[PDB]
Amino acid sequence: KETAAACFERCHMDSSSNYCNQMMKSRNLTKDRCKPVNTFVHESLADVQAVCSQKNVACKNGQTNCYQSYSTMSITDCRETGSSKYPNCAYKTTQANKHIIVACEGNPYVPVHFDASV
Numbered sequence: 803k804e805t806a807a808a809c810f811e812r813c814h815m816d817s818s819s820n821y822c823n824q825m826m827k828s829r830n831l832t833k834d835r836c837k838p839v840n841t842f843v844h845e846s847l848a849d850v851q852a853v854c855s856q857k858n859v860a861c862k863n864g865q866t867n868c869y870q871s872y873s874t875m876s877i878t879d880c881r882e883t884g885s886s887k888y889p890n891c892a893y894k895t896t897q898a899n900k901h902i903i904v905a906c907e908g909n910p911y912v913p914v915h916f917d918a919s920v
């Protein structure tokens with residue numbers, strides 16, 4: 803199996819052949835389905851992992867293992883278009899600098915879900 807931490811890295815780390823279409827396919831998000839929404843983070847792995855000891859915040863789901871980054875980070879939001887359907891997944895690409903919120907788990911205590919950005 804792929805671990806939770808490995809899944810996070812494959813889906814979220816990136817330290818109409820548009821970027822989203824390309825990367826969602828490369829990273830095996832859209833080889834076998836079309837995923838509605840995915841964010842990639844253009845920062846070092848280690849700088850993202852460092853968010854797990856930053857500001858503790860509630861997760862959308864009410865758990866309290868989420869952490870918001872002090873700094874805004876370069877991110878690309880990929881969101882499916884209205885007509886997108888498998889196998890021809892189609893994405894809108896939106897680049898932004900925003901604080902990230904990740905859920906953290908394990909020893910070492912590392913990101914395991916991308917909760918949001920703000």
Ligand SMILES: [Hg+2]
Binds near residue numbers: 809914
């Ligand atoms: Hg995952």
Ligand SMILES: [Hg+2]
Binds near residue numbers: 810
């Ligand atoms: Hg994943």
